[PDB]
Design a protein around this nucleic acid. Structure first.
Lengths: 125, 60, 78, 149, 95, 108
RNA sequence: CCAGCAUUCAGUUGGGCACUCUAAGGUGACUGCCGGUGACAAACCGGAGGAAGGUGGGGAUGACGUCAAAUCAUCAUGCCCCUUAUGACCUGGGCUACACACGUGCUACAAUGGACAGAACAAAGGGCAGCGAAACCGCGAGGUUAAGCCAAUCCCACAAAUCUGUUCUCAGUUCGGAUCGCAGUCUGCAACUCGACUGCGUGAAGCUGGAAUCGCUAGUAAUCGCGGAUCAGCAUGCCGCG
RNA sequence: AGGAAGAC
C-alpha cells in the first residue's frame, strides 16, 4: 500500500501501489479510450521495465488539475516517489540515472508593457 | 470650469442614464475606480500617504 | 423601438394630430431628430433642425419604417 | 560570453533499438500525430514492398544523400563580399539535413502529407533529388570558391 | 455555531485566533482549531504618469483573508460571555 | 437547369444548390432534410419525381430574379426618398457607419 | 480530500486527516567538502547527499545628472477679458466626416486544413439597484416564473487548440469573411447621424506579399482559449491566468 | 598598412 505524490506544471497526482500481479490503472478507466498520446504509454511503461519490479505491484492513480503533458510529468514524479518509497536499495541508481529533477518550469508571470512576458510589442524609428 | 460639472455631479440629473461617475475627492472623470471612487492620480498619492488599508505594493 | 412600437415626442405628436384633424397648416417647427414617422403623418411639411437652420421637408407616402432623422444630414462635403 | 551546452536523455541506455525506438516514440510532437503516423507507417510499408530489399538502409542512404558535408558563409573583406567555406560540426550537419528535408518536403507541393514525405524520402534515396541537388549546389559553390580558405 | 473573521492583517488575526481558542478552551466549549480559508485577491493597475507614457504602469495589491472556527456543544452562558468579551478593531468578527 | 442556370455535376446536392442565386447552405440543408436525399447525392443519379418536387419547392421559394428585383426596388425607393442612406449608396461610401477615413476600401 | 470502510444514477451521505489544498513557525542552498589552477589570498573548472550550485525563476526596487524632455487638464501669488460675460441654463449637432499617406493590431490566402458527429484534460478573478441554476417557449440573440449565494457550497464555469469516423482532392473552392437588403433580440427617455448581437441571402479583395523592417534564449516564441477592469450596452484595445 | 562617402 505504498503511496506517492507527484507535482508537475500546475497539476498533482497521487499513486498507490500494493503487491498485485503487475496491473496498471489511472482513474479506473483503461488504456484504450482513456490514454491517448503514446508519450503517456512510454511514461507508463518505462520505469517498471527498467526495474526488476514490473509484475509484482499493481498501481491505482488519482489525478487532479492541469493538462496532458504536465499531467504526464506529474505521473513521472508520482511513480518516482512511489518507487523511492517502496524499494530504496537501487534508489541511488535511479538518482544518477536521473528523472528526479522536478523541473520548476511553470508559466511565466506576464509583464506590463510586454505581450507574453518576453515580447516587446513592436519598435520603429 | 470644473465646479459647474461638480454641481452636475452632486445634483440628481433629469434622466437616470445621464448620471455618471466622478471621484469627488480630486476633480476629474476618466479612470475613476468604482469601488473606491478615486481616480489614478489622487488614488496613488493618497495610497502612498497610506490610506485604503487593503492596498500596498504588488509583486508576485 | 424594436418590439413595442415607435417611440416619439408625444407633445408635438398630439399637436400635429390636432392640426391635421382640423385642417392643413404651415410647417411644423421641430428641434427633435428623435421621432419615428408614424404612418398617419402622410402629406405634412416638417421643419427639422439641422444644427444651423430648420430645413423644410414634405412627407411622402413611402415613409414606411425609418425615422425622421435622415432628412437633414448634418455634414456638408464639397 | 562563451558557448555552453546541457545534458538531457530521452531514451533508455540499454535494450533500446535506436531507429526503431525513434520511429515508434520520438521527435514528432504537437498534434496531428496519430493518423499521420499510421498512414506514414503504411507509406513506409508501401515503399518497403515497393523496393526489392530492406527499406531502412535506403532510408539511411537517403539521409546521407540529403546530409551535407560542407557549406559556405559570407564574410566581409574588400569590396566584393567574399565567401568562405568551412568544415562543419556534426550536430550542425544533422540540423541542416533534417531542416532541408522537412522544408523542401513541405515546400515542393503534392497531393497530401504522407505521400509527399515519402516522395522526398525516395527522392533522397535515389541520387537524382531536388534537395539532394541543393546539397550538391552547396558543394559546387564550396569547391568553386574554396580558393579562399 | 460557526464564527468567521476576515481582514487584511494576518498577524493580529493570528493572535486573535489563539485568544479566542484560549477563551473557548478555558470555558470548556468543545473547541475546534481555526481552519485557514483561502484568500481573495484584487490587483489594480494605475498609470504611473499623469498625462502620457502609457507603457509606464504600477500595480497595487489588495489581499484579504478569512478564518473559521466551530463550536459543537451549545454552552450558552460561555457563548454569551464570549459575545460580551471585547475584541480589537481589526479582527472583524462575523457570527 | 434548376433556376434556368446550370448546376455542377459531380458534387453533393446540399452544396451544389448553393451555386444558384439567392439560396444558401443552411436553406439548402433545411429543404433537403425534408426532401430526404441524405445530403450526399450526385446529380448523375436521381429520379424525375424528386426532381419535379424539388423544382416546385424551389419554384415556391424566392430564388431566381425576384430577390434581385426586390432589393433593386427597395434601393431605388431609397433613392427617391433620398434620406442620407440613399446618398451613401449613390456616393459609394460605407453605410452602416464606420470610420470612413481609415480603411473604407471594400467600397470605392 | 473519499486513502483506509459501509452505502446510492447526483462517490450527495454515516465516519476520518495521511496525502493535493488553503498557511503560520520553520526546515532548506550559504562557496557548505574533494581534486586541480590561482605564490597559499579573492576567485575559476570538474565532482556529492539534493528541489535547485555557484545571485534556483520572476517581480517590486530605477544613484548624481542630461534632454529649458511631457503635463498650468488636481492645487497656487504673476498679467490679461468678464462679472447687464471667454463666466452661466438647456435642445440639436460635432468629437465617429474623407480624394489620401502613415503607426499598432485582428482576420485570412488553406488539405500540418474546412464542415459535421462522438470522447475528452478543468488555472486565476467576479458577483445583492447583483450573480442568476433547473424547466418551458423560441429556425436566435433572448423571454417566463424563477431554487441557491452576502460566497473553498450557488452562478459566470458548457475551456478551446486535443483524440477517433465521413466528406471535399487543389479550385477564388465546402477557403476567406468584408461590404449590402430583409426580419429580429437586448440595453437605454432615445440606437438616423452614432451601440452590440442573431437568423437569412448576397458573397468582395486576397493564392503567404519588393525596397526595407520588428520581437524572441530552462514554458521562452508561436498558437489555443479563459477571466477581469471603465461601464445600462459596446473588443481586435489594456491588465492578468492557464 | 586592412573600401569613395557631403551638409546641418
Amino acid at each position: 500500500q505504498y503511496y506517492g505524490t507527484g507535482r508537475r506544471k500546475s497539476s498533482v497526482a497521487r499513486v498507490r501501489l500494493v503487491p498485485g500481479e503487475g496491473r496498471i490503472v489511472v482513474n479506473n478507466r483503461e488504456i484504450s479510450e482513456h490514454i491517448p498520446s503514446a508519450a503517456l504509454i512510454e511514461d507508463i511503461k518505462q520505469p517498471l521495465t527498467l526495474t526488476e519490479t514490473a509484475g509484482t505491484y499493481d498501481v491505482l492513480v488519482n489525478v487532479h488539475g492541469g493538462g496532458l503533458s504536465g499531467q504526464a510529468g506529474a505521473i513521472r514524479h508520482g511513480i518516482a516517489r512511489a518507487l523511492l518509497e517502496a524499494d530504496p536499495e537501487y534508489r541511488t541508481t535511479l538518482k544518477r540515472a536521473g528523472l528526479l529533477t522536478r523541473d520548476a518550469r511553470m508559466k511565466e508571470r506576464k509583464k506590463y508593457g510586454l505581450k507574453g512576458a518576453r515580447r516587446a510589442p513592436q519598435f520603429s524609428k | 470650469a470644473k465646479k459647474s460639472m461638480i454641481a452636475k455631479q452632486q445634483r440628481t440629473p433629469k434622466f437616470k442614464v445621464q448620471e455618471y461617475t466622478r471621484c469627488e475627492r480630486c476633480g476629474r472623470p476618466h479612470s475613476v475606480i468604482r469601488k473606491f471612487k478615486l481616480c489614478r492620480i489622487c488614488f496613488r498619492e493618497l495610497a502612498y500617504k497610506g490610506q485604503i488599508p487593503g492596498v500596498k505594493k504588488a509583486s508576485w | 423601438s424594436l418590439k413595442k412600437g415607435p417611440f416619439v415626442d408625444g407633445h408635438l405628436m398630439t399637436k400635429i394630430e390636432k392640426l391635421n384633424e382640423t385642417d392643413k397648416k404651415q410647417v411644423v417647427k421641430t428641434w427633435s431628430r428623435r421621432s419615428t414617422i408614424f404612418p398617419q403623418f402622410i402629406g405634412h411639411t416638417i421643419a427639422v433642425y439641422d444644427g444651423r437652420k430648420h430645413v423644410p421637408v414634405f412627407i411622402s407616402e413611402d415613409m414606411v419604417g425609418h425615422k425622421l432623422g435622415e432628412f437633414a444630414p448634418t455634414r456638408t462635403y464639397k | 560570453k562563451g558557448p555552453v551546452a546541457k545534458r538531457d536523455v530521452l531514451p533508455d541506455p540499454i535494450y533500446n533499438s535506436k531507429l526503431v525506438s525513434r520511429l515508434i516514440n520520438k521527435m514528432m510532437i504537437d498534434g496531428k500525430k496519430g493518423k499521420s503516423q499510421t498512414i506514414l507507417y503504411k507509406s513506409f510499408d508501401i515503399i518497403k514492398e515497393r523496393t526489392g530489399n530492406d527499406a531502412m538502409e535506403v532510408f539511411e542512404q537517403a539521409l546521407k544523400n540529403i546530409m551535407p558535408v560542407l557549406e559556405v558563409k559570407a564574410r566581409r573583406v574588400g569590396g566584393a563580399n567574399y565567401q568562405v567555406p568551412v568544415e562543419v560540426r556534426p550536430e550542425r550537419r544533422t540540423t541542416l539535413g533534417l531542416r532541408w528535408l522537412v522544408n523542401y518536403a513541405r515546400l515542393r507541393g503534392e497531393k497530401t502529407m504522407e505521400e509527399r514525405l515519402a516522395n522526398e524520402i525516395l527522392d533522397a534515396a535515389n541520387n537524382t533529388g531536388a534537395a539532394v541537388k541543393k546539397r550538391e549546389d552547396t558543394h559546387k559553390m564550396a569547391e568553386a570558391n574554396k580558393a579562399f580558405a | 455555531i460557526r464564527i468567521r473573521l476576515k481582514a487584511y492583517d494576518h498577524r493580529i488575526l493570528d493572535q486573535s485566533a489563539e485568544k479566542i481558542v484560549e477563551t473557548a478552551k478555558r470555558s470548556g466549549a468543545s473547541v475546534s482549531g481555526p481552519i485557514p480559508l483561502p484568500t481573495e485577491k484584487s490587483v489594480y493597475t494605475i498609470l504611473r504618469a499623469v498625462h502620457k507614457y502609457k507603457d509606464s504602469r504600477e500595480q497595487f495589491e489588495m489581499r484579504t483573508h478569512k478564518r473559521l472556527i466551530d463550536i459543537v456543544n451549545p454552552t450558552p452562558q460561555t457563548v454569551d460571555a464570549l459575545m460580551r468579551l471585547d475584541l480589537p478593531s481589526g479582527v472583524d468578527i462575523e457570527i | 437547369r434548376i433556376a434556368g442556370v446550370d448546376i455542377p455535376r459531380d458534387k453533393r446536392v446540399v452544396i451544389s444548390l448553393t451555386y444558384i442565386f439567392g439560396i444558401g447552405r443552411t436553406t439548402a440543408q433545411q429543404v433537403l432534410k425534408e426532401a430526404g436525399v441524405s445530403e450526399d447525392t450526385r446529380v448523375r443519379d436521381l429520379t424525375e419525381e424528386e426532381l419535379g418536387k424539388i423544382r416546385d419547392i424551389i419554384d415556391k421559394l424566392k430564388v431566381e430574379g425576384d430577390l434581385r428585383r426586390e432589393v433593386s426596388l427597395n434601393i431605388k425607393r431609397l433613392i427617391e426618398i433620398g434620406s442620407y442612406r440613399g446618398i451613401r449608396h449613390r456616393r459609394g461610401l460605407p453605410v452602416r457607419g464606420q470610420n470612413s477615413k481609415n480603411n473604407a476600401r471594400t467600397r470605392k
